């Protein structure tokens, strides 16, 4: 049962980075090098592993996190980084064991006049934990006076929409991202590679 990787990488709709969704993958065989070779990938780094080696390995469970950002921010989807995305939207742990997959989707998530549906958290009073997810739309109190709901000075709606237009620069164009994380518990491994000892 080769897993539904196409269910995630080929999903017609992707989430905003602030409300990134996670797909638990389990009970299947994973052909990671076939995923590598499906190509059209501008970023494909693995931390602590190699694709070729890991489709000989198995793990307890695998998780696929997907969302949209833009080109200049994919660097933030790496361990130990800072910035609006890593600090306020999607944070990876320093001991990350997985791969980060990203590819330009300007042909799909941009439109003439701008696609404002993709959002990202602009303000947050503390940085996120690794793999924490905060979807709060409450107005952000940037100063010492309370907002009492109303938008006003020092009181901002916390989410900003990307201005995705087909004519933006490489760094301001949409990029779909998928982060695979490999969970090895002291428990039966149910996501194996074709070349593992299990198959």
């Amino acid at each position, epitope marked *: 049962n080769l897993c539904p990787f196409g269910e995630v990488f080929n999903a017609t709709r992707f989430a905003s980075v602030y409300a990134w969704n*996670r797909k638990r993958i389990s009970n299947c065989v994973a052909d990671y090098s076939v995923l590598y070779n499906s190509a059209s990938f501008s970023t494909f780094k693995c931390y602590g592993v190699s694709p070729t080696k890991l489709n000989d390995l198995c793990f307890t469970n695998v998780y696929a996190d997907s969302f949209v950002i833009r080109g200049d921010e994919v660097r933030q989807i790496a361990p130990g980084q800072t910035g609006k995305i890593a600090d306020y939207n999607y944070k990876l742990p320093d001991d990350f064991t997985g791969c980060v997959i990203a590819w330009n989707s300007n042909n799909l998530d941009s439109k003439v006049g701008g696609n404002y549906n993709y959002l990202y958290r602009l303000f947050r009073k503390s940085n996120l934990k690794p*793999f924490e*997810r905060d979807i709060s739309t409450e107005i952000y109190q940037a100063g010492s006076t309370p907002c009492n709901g109303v938008e006003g000075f020092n009181c901002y709606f916390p989410l900003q929409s990307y201005g995705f237009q087909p004519t933006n620069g490489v760094g301001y164009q949409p990029y779909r991202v998928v982060v695979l994380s490999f969970e090895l*518990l002291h428990a039966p491994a149910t996501v194996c590679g074709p070349g593992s000892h299990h198959h």
Partner: antibody, heavy 121, light 108 residues
Framework: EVQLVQSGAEVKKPGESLKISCKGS????????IAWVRQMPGKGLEWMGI????????TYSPSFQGQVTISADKSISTAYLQWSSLKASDTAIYYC??????????????WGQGTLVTVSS | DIQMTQSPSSLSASVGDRVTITCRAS??????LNWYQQKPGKAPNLLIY???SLQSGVPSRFSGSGSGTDFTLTISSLQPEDFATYYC?????????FGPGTKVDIKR
């Protein structure tokens, strides 16, 4: 089906240890904070503390700091509440609850059913 | 600790009534206020968060308003399932604190 399920009722004597559990399913357990709330017989609700299962970072209410331990085991998607020496005054119902998110109103959007703890000699 | 108050402490109402419960905080809490429902033998359920945001799955007849120190929970038309105790909870400061709750019994 986001759900938290707590362990069953407990009957202990003063001075004994106790550990109760709160198992979560239907969501990414490591990605949301867990609160513990006390409700003493015929009383209201008291916020005891919070924990982030991803790394077990905890912040207690000052009224409960040093009186109880909040811990977690992400490998089985479970949070704990733990006493080393029980007192009769600990007789109450204890709930665990998920925070929809950490910031702002930090609402408790999903609760476990509660664990009744009875301390009696 | 921020002290949360609710009035009335108890309320008699009839099915179909418009019921309003108030919550007062000992200091301003912007709109960092949540409302919960609890019935005997049951665990609380979230009704309203951030003063006026309706939790998904909650009937539309529930609504919240207010800010600063004054808040109100309103039920447009009381239904048989709505007889219960209602708590407010401030999230402006740590430690989080709840109001003492207001029970809404059937009028007779």
């Amino acid at each position: 089906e986001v759900q938290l399920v707590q362990s069953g009722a407990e009957v202990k004597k003063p001075g004994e240890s106790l550990k109760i559990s709160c198992k979560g399913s239907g969501y990414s357990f490591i990605s949301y904070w867990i609160a513990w709330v006390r409700q003493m017989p015929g009383k209201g609700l008291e916020w005891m503390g919070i924990i982030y299962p991803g790394d077990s970072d905890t912040t207690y209410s000052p009224s409960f700091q040093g009186q109880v331990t909040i811990s977690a085991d992400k490998s089985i998607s479970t949070a704990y509440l733990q006493w080393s020496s029980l007192k009769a005054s600990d007789t109450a119902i204890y709930y665990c609850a998920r925070l929809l998110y950490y910031s702002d109103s930090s609402p408790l959007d999903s609760w476990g059913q509660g664990t009744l703890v009875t301390v009696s000699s | 600790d921020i002290q949360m108050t609710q009035s009335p402490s108890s309320l008699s109402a009839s099915v179909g009534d418009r019921v309003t419960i108030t919550c007062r905080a000992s200091q301003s809490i912007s709109t960092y206020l949540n409302w919960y429902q609890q019935k005997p033998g049951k665990a609380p359920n979230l009704l309203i968060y951030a003063a006026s945001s309706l939790q998904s799955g909650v009937p539309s007849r529930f609504s919240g308003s207010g800010s600063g120190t004054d808040f109100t929970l309103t039920i447009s038309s009381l239904q048989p399932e709505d007889f219960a105790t209602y708590y407010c909870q401030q999230s402006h400061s740590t430690p989080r604190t709840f109001g003492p709750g207001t029970k809404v019994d059937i009028k007779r």
